[PDB]
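Q: How do we represent a protein-ligand complex in a form that can be generated token by token?
A: Start from the inputs.
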Amino acid sequence: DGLKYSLATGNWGDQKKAHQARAGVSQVLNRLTFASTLSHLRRLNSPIGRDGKLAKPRQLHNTLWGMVCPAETPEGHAVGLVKNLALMAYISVGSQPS
Amino acid sequence: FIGKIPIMLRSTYCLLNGLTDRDLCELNECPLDPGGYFIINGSEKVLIAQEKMATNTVYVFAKKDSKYAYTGECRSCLENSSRPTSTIWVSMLARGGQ
Amino acid sequence: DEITPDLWQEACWIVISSYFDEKGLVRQQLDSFDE
Amino acid sequence: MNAPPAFESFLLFEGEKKITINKDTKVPNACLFTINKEDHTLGNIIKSQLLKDPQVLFAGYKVPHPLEHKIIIRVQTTPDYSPQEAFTNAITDLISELSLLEERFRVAIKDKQEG
Amino acid sequence: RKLRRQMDIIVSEVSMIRDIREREIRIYTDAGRICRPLLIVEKQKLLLKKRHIDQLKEREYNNYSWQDLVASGVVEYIDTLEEETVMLAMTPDDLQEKEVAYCSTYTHCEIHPSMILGVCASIIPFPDHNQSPRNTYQSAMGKQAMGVYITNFHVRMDTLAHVLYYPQKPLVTTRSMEYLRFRELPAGINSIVAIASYTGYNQEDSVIMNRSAVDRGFFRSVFYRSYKEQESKKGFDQEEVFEKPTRETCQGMRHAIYDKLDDDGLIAPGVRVSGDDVIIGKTVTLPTKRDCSTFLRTSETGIVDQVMVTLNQEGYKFCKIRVRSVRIPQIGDKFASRHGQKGTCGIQYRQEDMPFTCEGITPDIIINPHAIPSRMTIGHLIECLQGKVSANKGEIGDATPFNDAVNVQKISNLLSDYGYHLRGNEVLYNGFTGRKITSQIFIGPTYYQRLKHMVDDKIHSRARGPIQILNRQPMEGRSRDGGLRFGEMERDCQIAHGAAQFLRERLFEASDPYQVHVCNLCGIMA
Amino acid sequence: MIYICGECHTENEIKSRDPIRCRECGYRIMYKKRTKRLVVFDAR
Amino acid sequence: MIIPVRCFTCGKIVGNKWEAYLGLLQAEYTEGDALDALGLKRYCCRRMLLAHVDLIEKLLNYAPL
Amino acid sequence: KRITTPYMTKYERARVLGTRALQIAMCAPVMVELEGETDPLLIAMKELKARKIPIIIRRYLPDGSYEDWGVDELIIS
Amino acid sequence: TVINNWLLIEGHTIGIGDSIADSKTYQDIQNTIKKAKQDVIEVIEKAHNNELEPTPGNTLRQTFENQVNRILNDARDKTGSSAQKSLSEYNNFKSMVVSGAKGSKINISQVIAVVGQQNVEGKRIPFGFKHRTLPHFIKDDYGPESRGFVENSYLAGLTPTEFFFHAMGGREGLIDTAVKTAETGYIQRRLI
Amino acid sequence: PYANQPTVRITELTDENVKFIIENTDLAVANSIRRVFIAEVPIIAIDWVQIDANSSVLHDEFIAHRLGLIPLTSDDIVDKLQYSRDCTCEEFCPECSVEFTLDVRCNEDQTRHVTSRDLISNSPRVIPVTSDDILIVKLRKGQELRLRAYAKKGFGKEHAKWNPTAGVAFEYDPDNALRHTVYPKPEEWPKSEYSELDEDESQAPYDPNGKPERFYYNVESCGSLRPETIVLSALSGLKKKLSDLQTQLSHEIQ
Amino acid sequence: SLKQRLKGKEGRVRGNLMGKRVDFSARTVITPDPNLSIDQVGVPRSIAANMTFAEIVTPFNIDRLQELVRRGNSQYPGAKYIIRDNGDRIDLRFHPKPSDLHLQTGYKVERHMCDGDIVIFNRQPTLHKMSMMGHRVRILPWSTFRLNLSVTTPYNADFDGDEMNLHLPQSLETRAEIQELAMVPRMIVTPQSNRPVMGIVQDTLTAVRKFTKRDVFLERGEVMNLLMFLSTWDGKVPQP
RNA sequence: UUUUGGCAUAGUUGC
Ligand SMILES: [Mg+2]
Ligand SMILES: [Zn+2]
Ligand SMILES: [Zn+2]
Ligand SMILES: [Zn+2]
Ligand SMILES: [Zn+2]
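Then emit the structure tokens for the protein with zinc ion bound:
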């Protein structure tokens, strides 16, 4: 029930601790075009946090060359915070250093 | 038995793993559907990737809004255990102190 | 032996086609969940 | 849902006059012909025919709105020649022209088919 | 690096950074790092030779895949932290050729620069010929176009779906679109668009459309709504059941006719319905029995496409009813190029009224000239020219961003070879008078997208409707109804006008008129 | 009422009282049959 | 989805030419040669066959009801 | 002993016309001869031009006093 | 109404031919850009050899930055002037700009001649990488294209580095649009 | 103050199109004829569809919309028909409509193409034009499509399926002697097929006394009517409209 | 808590007293229409048939409103309600009783919004007086509001998907107030910068720049065709 | 014989 609840609501953390639970992690998959579905599946989110208060994360940084699409960000109050992977970008899955 | 884990579609434990296009059409599943999402109560839910600061790395900033000239933090985190990550600041006091 | 400049335009897109035949587009999600 | 039925651009609903004549008081010998359920098909051709009449001082037409199927034709003639008479003469000339063109087109088809 | 390139003890995704000036070697193996593959350059030469390309051409029936390129030590994954220590060639054919030396120590080379773009930015033809906010805007709109969102849409029952009747692959395409499956699931139509001022209904980013083209199915579409409903039995106090209810066994029902429903409380697929009609007749027992049947959205109208019945996770019988509504394009519906040229249908003209070339080719769409100069979507114009060239040549044009083999001068020469003006302009005739237009109109095919924002889903009006239960003010019912908030800014506007009576009318007797009794001695209510 | 099984296409009658299940496959998805009321379209 | 009956612009019949078009492509015609062989001069008509995607073939893989 | 402007203000014109149109809509006697007039607002504007509206505007100065102006007394601008 | 009905006879359009210039104009623009880049190189090598002396009230970095900025602005204005002089009276782009209906002269110059310098926070593109704007440049490169000077027109198409730097530039305008929408009427709603 | 004496010269006549030239006529008359070709020549097209059974992948409205665009041989039968709403019948009759029936059951292991050949009319003179054939839909095994339809008289102004033409090429003054269009660089523009200029010339000299005449037509038929029949019915219909307007004007004057 | 019920944007004060939902309001997308005067607004037939205005029954309008009553709410233009003098309300969707369709003077009839009705028209965010102005209703047969192009500048609107709101004043007093204070012609010149807010925009501005060039000449047919579209023309063709 | 209704959290999207 906890996994089902967390993926159903997108609130992450304990259900009783929804006050401190990061929200919107899990979203309903977008089905308007194939491109919309693909872009939703390859989406990255920048939480606001305390870090957002320190350095301006909205503006496009040079290190996003080849990793993140430079010209795909949602307009409005989420500009530059929600991003999309570049086509050949691939996220390391992690292995053991031993 | 201890619970039920949701399965991301077309992952290596989904029943659609490694099936031909004819088989996917036999199951009324689009062969171009990339998967990569869960089904929770029939609703197709996608987990958005969340960016955060990398761990176990020394980062030296200069807090413009404090009595510290510089602060060297390190969000130290164990090797895939104890998700509470202990962050430690090592800060040089500003010379304009009392 | 070496890829000539005129043939390079075909060659690079052959490489990228082989990539997307191998990994696909949602490799991040599937690999992370498999791990 | 507000889309009009497509037939309300050539069909007269009941209680609608096809053509209505109104005297224009600004200038003597001037009339406005409001024709319902017509478009540039008849407006432009009637205006062009009327312009060939020497006794017509002014001949113009307008569609007041593309979504409304009225055409207003303003005709002003010399003060010995009613605008209504000019309008009738223009239509008769156009009908004679089109009948002649039908006849010559049939003859041309027969000659081309025969060789 | 030798070991990682050989897929030895070090796996490919491990990243190794040498901070030379600070005397550090940092090796990262954890997850979450983002990397991309780069061709390896050694001694100003690629390690990718023709033999690899030959083996990859016959990728089928050889099993020489991408993983064998990685195993060959020809291409390797590089992350941003390691990109800091990388001298990268944008392209082999020029950057590492001999020259007046700029850099002679390249370590990697880009596969193709166009792979910096994402999914929705990779469907833009000639994005390097646009102002970048227009590329951002197209990245936003391409998610909202109409197409065929999935092949098995017939069996699915999504809450909302839009399916375009006749999608087409773009006549002017990118190589990246080959791998997005966009050729197989397109979203939009190649439309003969003319950039011309006309009767005046395309101004300010509006669009005139060809009515006769729409009559031939141009941009026609379908909108599917699935309504789910589950009866539940909580012990025995309440028992919801599907059945067509009657006035003589229920204590409250709508005047909407229940004869649509069969005698299980379910309407059949193929029945025409409207916004008030009942689609699932459900009734709950009274502790006679009150109904709790469900109706259509009040604005909507359609034909019941499909009616499925199952048992839920609990085991209670529950059904899902997909209703089909055919959306013809009309005045108000959105359309967009792949360049941020958003715009609503201003007016629809029949074929005889549209302007026409000397060949009888009327435009499907007329867009205003003034949409171009401030926006500087030159990629739109180049797409139109390339579309004309490709449609005449019997070829699919290529519009990858960074491709010097494609040049507007070459496209102009190719177009001149087909007996057209080299810049795409044409002598158009006025549809009404038949006269030649004094200027020569730029015209040609262009890929347009019908966005999901139809007017019929956005139109509503309120007058004396269902107020709130607490506030006694208008409320958003099962629709867009419930009035519009006459917010603070509107009140300040009307104060600036001095329209005090109108301001009172809006804020008092048009929302919640009321009266009370107050004692004159004690000012508390009585 | 007649329902069509979603896996083996068997038209089977079901009352408003019994749980739905295909009577030769056990499948638990059923589709209502197309209406027999006349439906007419203009071809526009 | 399926080939439109009419060209959207000029209203020429183009629905009876998809199968022949594919047949000519199996005869190793260039796509321009195939469109010329089918007598499609105006690029409005040529756009129809040249950019059509026959998705109905993919839809006939699923079982009927 | 009046100090307010002799010109009817825009707001005075607006309220006078609205009020008089409401009165005429309520079958009030009309103070001007009308021909082919049915909308109360046109009749009210005809009365205003005729200066035959039977209304007195009470303008409150910002000291708790007032001035009463017959509508015919004010200049219809 | 009157002028919209006359425009059915006149007609008004915009096409590729309204963005083409004469070959002489392209050669003049390319010569201007060659010269401007070579002067930027002269300023760079004079700074590297310590032969550049700071202006009063500015450090050597601010002096150098103002020098390259004024060189590139001079180049952009000269290219825009030459592009505007090449325009014919029939150029629909000019016909729209002259009436004030849409666009302006800078848009003509950007479409035809040179997009120009990209700026984030009002300065050239910063060294986001370690002493680099991108990994395709050498370290400590203050050349124009290295620091985000787009030398192509929108007609000619931007190079990959130029495309990314232009995206960086436009992201700022998007962010300011969002911030204005955030501050739309807040000052007003307190003032009222 | 009277009519022109227009003259016709047919330059080409095939079963697909007629190409001809009209001289000694006003531009307005020529454009009105060109416009009547598209919008006012009545033909027969499917406009009433009852679907008794559909199992195809395409929903019912898709099939009906595709059936409407099927062109029908309406060469001579259209003249003796009446508009349905004008007809006094109980909604349908052989004097205002033509019945069609389609019944195709794909009971085989190959994709069955439901083409225009499967449309069966109750009148032999009104068939699908292709009767290679126009594809209506494709059917899988066990998919039935069974419907009846009626095709009625109408013209393209109401809906584009009654449009008989497949593109009406229209031209005048191919060398631009009148300068109704102003080329910024006349050298760049290819000659019209009707141009009489040598290749060293780009534009005829300006004619201050010129007037548009010698209008070049190329009327391509979709197939419902022969192009000869399209033009003749167009002229007849425009004459009929003008005579009806004459009748109404005479009534209004009286 | 009771504090949170009043605090903030959504409390009773700022959410339900300084601004609130209102009846007799409609919203939809806007499309251009150069054939409307600047003070007119196109309205779909559905919105007009849905929204209503109270006409007081007067012997000048007794027969007209009786006809509107007999048409009922089912048909446009029509009426929804009859408010008799007692305050009782007769709903003209459900009462074929002819006795209830009698109209004595002083009754009110909530007739459908017909042509020429005054409506306040607004686009949010509302930033100045010219963002809410009075228009005359014109019924047009599609599902969008229509504006003259010149008024797109005061509203800061463009037909790229923008929606606009339409409020109908519901009594002759407020209707006269809007007619005399907030109509579009009265809002041409702003007091902000003592200048016009509406101007000639886009196609018309480029076309007038082309038109008033020294070397534009018009044949007589063109001149007469253009003078058809001149509402203030005195009918006299000027000397060439 | 003339009805009426969840709400208040989060997300997404439009200008
Ligand atoms: Mg807008
Ligand atoms: Zn008291
Ligand atoms: Zn079964
Ligand atoms: Zn065509
Ligand atoms: Zn009949």
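Strands of chain A lie at 26-28, 43-45, 82-84, 90-91. Chain A touches chain C at residues 38, 41-42, 85, 88, 90-91, 93-94 (CB under 8 Å).
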